[PDB]
Amino acid sequence: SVYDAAAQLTADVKKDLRDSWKVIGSDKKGNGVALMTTLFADNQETIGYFKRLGNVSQGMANDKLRGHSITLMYALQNFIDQLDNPDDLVCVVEKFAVNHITRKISAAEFGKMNGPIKKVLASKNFGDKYANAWAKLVAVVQAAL
Amino acid sequence: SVYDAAAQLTADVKKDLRDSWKVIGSDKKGNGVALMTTLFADNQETIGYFKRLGNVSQGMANDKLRGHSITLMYALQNFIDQLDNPDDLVCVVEKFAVNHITRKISAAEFGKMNGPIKKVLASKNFGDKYANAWAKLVAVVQAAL
Ligand code: HEM
Ligand code: HEM
């Protein structure tokens, strides 16, 4: 199942993922926080899953939110680093899904991250072509939920 | 406290952490699995916390163990990257501790990783000086458990 989704990661898709990550991943704190705050802005209901982070309206200044945001970026770093070996990509994605499954986060709920990603890519001038590539990566994770 | 522990990361300790990580972090899959297998070999009592992984003796062939081992290395990568900013290191460490606290992993339990780290370091020609630097980093996490 996850393997089949991974099959959509064509040579061109992996190339766009790597090229865009080279920029996005260069500022994990800044972009990580941008993703989370955008998610909360566009889909307020997702805040229900982050009660532990406290006052998320504080953004970057909120230590717990900042800690979560930076950490989230290292999961993507992990995924990006395993793109050339489907076997490693798959085992890393299934390992990542475990805690999210426990939190009862469905594939549909997880898919809400596509908008924030598209918006962050755009802020760095990466168009639809790149947003589509990332949608495919998110789809691999969705296959594991 | 975690804030006092973070202050123990002096200039040379940070430098030795970076220099050794440059090598160790080069092969996350290889060294990550070596780290876990050494832990299970030297402290069989810890295997109980990893029931979900299945037959841990299979090493690299165990997909779940490989997935976990690779992922563990990105938490260390995270810590190393935050060495420049104590405030970020602390929020990233507390974030990391949440799940380990939920699993009831105590500071004493966590410290058992010092043995495996020292051995992997040694296998790459990094002696006591480096093992001690890493123990200082591990102590920051212990302070948060
Ligand atoms: C590209 C998307 C995402 C990435 C890379 C990501 C990454 C992570 C990582 C690495 C962690 C820490 C390890 C763990 O506990 O699992 C985590 C925690 C968490 N994630 Fe995800 N996640 C993503 C999307 C989501 C979404 C869409 C939701 C909810 C709507 C979600 C909810 C959670 C929650 C509630 C936590 C715990 C937060 C805390 O209390 O510190 N994640 N995620
Ligand atoms: C260098 C030290 C260590 C690092 C960097 C580390 C890293 C991680 C990471 C990144 C995860 C995934 C996120 C999460 O679920 O929290 C994790 C999971 C876990 N860790 Fe730690 N950990 C370390 C030591 C330990 C020790 C010493 C124990 C137990 C004695 C432990 C027990 C666990 C368990 C049971 C899981 C879940 C495994 C699974 O079911 O997939 N960790 N750890």
Side-chain angles (χ1 to χ4, degrees):
Chain A
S1 187
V2 181
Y3 268 108
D4 293 339
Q8 293 295 296
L9 297 179
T10 63
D12 290 347
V13 169
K14 296 196 281 185
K15 170 59 178 176
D16 288 340
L17 285 173
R18 291 181 179 115
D19 285 6
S20 52
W21 183 248
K22 182 171 299 192
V23 171
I24 297 303
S26 63
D27 181 7
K28 293 182 176 63
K29 174 165 63 176
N31 295 322
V33 170
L35 283 174
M36 290 310 292
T37 59
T38 296
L39 177 74
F40 296 151
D42 299 342
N43 295 80
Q44 51 161 39
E45 73 279 7
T46 62
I47 297 176
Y49 293 96
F50 299 95
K51 188 181 60 181
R52 191 190 77 73
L53 301 192
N55 190 177
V56 296
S57 77
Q58 284 175 162
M60 183 76 82
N62 181 145
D63 296 332
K64 292 188 183 305
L65 175 58
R66 197 171 66 262
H68 170 72
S69 301
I70 293 171
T71 298
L72 170 158
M73 297 300 272
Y74 283 96
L76 299 175
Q77 179 68 64
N78 190 342
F79 300 160
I80 295 295
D81 283 349
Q82 321 308 324
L83 289 178
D84 290 315
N85 192 314
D87 294 320
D88 290 334
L89 178 64
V90 172
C91 77
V92 159
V93 169
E94 296 189 302
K95 159 66 182 185
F96 165 96
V98 178
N99 291 339
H100 288 83
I101 289 167
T102 294
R103 296 180 183 111
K104 297 155 296 183
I105 295 164
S106 69
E109 197 65 41
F110 196 83
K112 291 183 184 180
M113 256 297 171
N114 277 148
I117 292 177
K118 173 170 184 166
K119 286 187 171 66
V120 173
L121 287 167
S123 75
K124 297 299 181 296
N125 294 306
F126 286 103
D128 302 338
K129 190 171 110 82
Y130 292 95
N132 292 324
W134 278 88
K136 290 172 178 296
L137 182 54
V138 170
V140 175
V141 177
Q142 287 179 299
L145 298 177
Chain B
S1 68
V2 66
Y3 309 81
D4 292 318
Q8 306 305 294
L9 299 185
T10 61
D12 281 311
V13 171
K14 296 197 289 182
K15 180 58 175 165
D16 292 335
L17 284 176
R18 289 186 201 285
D19 289 336
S20 52
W21 180 248
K22 189 181 183 301
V23 173
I24 298 301
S26 291
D27 180 16
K28 295 184 173 60
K29 176 163 63 177
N31 293 156
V33 168
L35 222 45
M36 293 305 301
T37 54
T38 298
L39 173 75
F40 295 142
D42 298 346
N43 296 83
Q44 283 277 310
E45 73 269 24
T46 63
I47 298 179
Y49 294 107
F50 299 91
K51 306 167 187 171
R52 192 191 74 78
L53 274 42
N55 186 183
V56 131
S57 67
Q58 294 301 300
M60 196 68 76
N62 184 318
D63 295 326
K64 297 179 183 297
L65 178 59
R66 198 173 66 257
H68 169 76
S69 303
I70 290 172
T71 300
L72 174 150
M73 296 297 274
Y74 282 95
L76 293 182
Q77 179 70 60
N78 190 339
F79 300 157
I80 296 301
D81 286 344
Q82 315 313 312
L83 289 183
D84 291 310
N85 195 318
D87 289 326
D88 289 341
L89 175 68
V90 168
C91 76
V92 159
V93 169
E94 290 185 76
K95 161 65 174 179
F96 168 96
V98 178
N99 292 346
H100 288 78
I101 292 173
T102 297
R103 299 171 183 126
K104 307 193 77 306
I105 305 299
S106 67
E109 206 85 67
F110 199 81
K112 292 180 180 169
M113 203 54 196
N114 279 146
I117 292 175
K118 173 176 294 172
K119 289 186 177 179
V120 171
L121 253 1
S123 74
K124 303 298 172 56
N125 266 254
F126 287 103
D128 285 37
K129 166 183 167 181
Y130 296 95
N132 289 155
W134 278 88
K136 280 283 193 70
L137 180 59
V138 174
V140 179
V141 179
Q142 290 178 295
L145 295 173

